[PDB]
Design a protein around this ligand. Structure first.
Ligand SMILES: Cn1cc(C(=O)NCCN)ccc1=O
Length: 115
């Protein structure tokens, strides 16, 4: 509360660590469904069904222009990519399985980096 300061973690490296985590995502071989925004004019149903589209390049742009206030909002956009994926794809499709793989890949790097 007011004048009651909780001891807080060092966040000076958060930007560089999130950038390196995103780089590992972008270079993962299963990252192809998520590198670029879903083409709303070439895919039937996505614009209406998916109310918050998100992809790695948009996350990269928001990270490179100071649009994430903290690292929690960064992980929100990353998880939004895979939440959208589950909403729109079957689990045993190539894209649906890539999302599950990429999500598990992310959450371990998130724990190994900040926890
Ligand atoms: C990540 N993601 C990719 C597609 C896509 O590109 N579909 C083309 C079908 N061959 C659709 C939904 C989704 O969430």
């Amino acid at each position: 509360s007011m004048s009651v300061k909780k001891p807080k973690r060092d966040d000076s490296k958060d930007l560089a660590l999130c950038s390196m985590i995103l780089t590992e995502m972008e270079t993962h071989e299963d990252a192809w469904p998520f590198l670029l925004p879903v083409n709303l004019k070439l895919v039937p149903g996505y614009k209406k069904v998916i109310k918050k589209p998100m992809d790695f390049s948009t996350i990269r742009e928001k990270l490179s222009s100071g649009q994430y206030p903290n690292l929690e909002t960064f992980a929100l956009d990353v998880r939004l990519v895979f939440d959208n994926c589950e909403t729109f794809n079957e689990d045993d499709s190539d894209i649906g399985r890539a999302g599950h793989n990429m999500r598990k890949y992310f959450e371990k790097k998130w724990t190994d980096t900040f926890k």
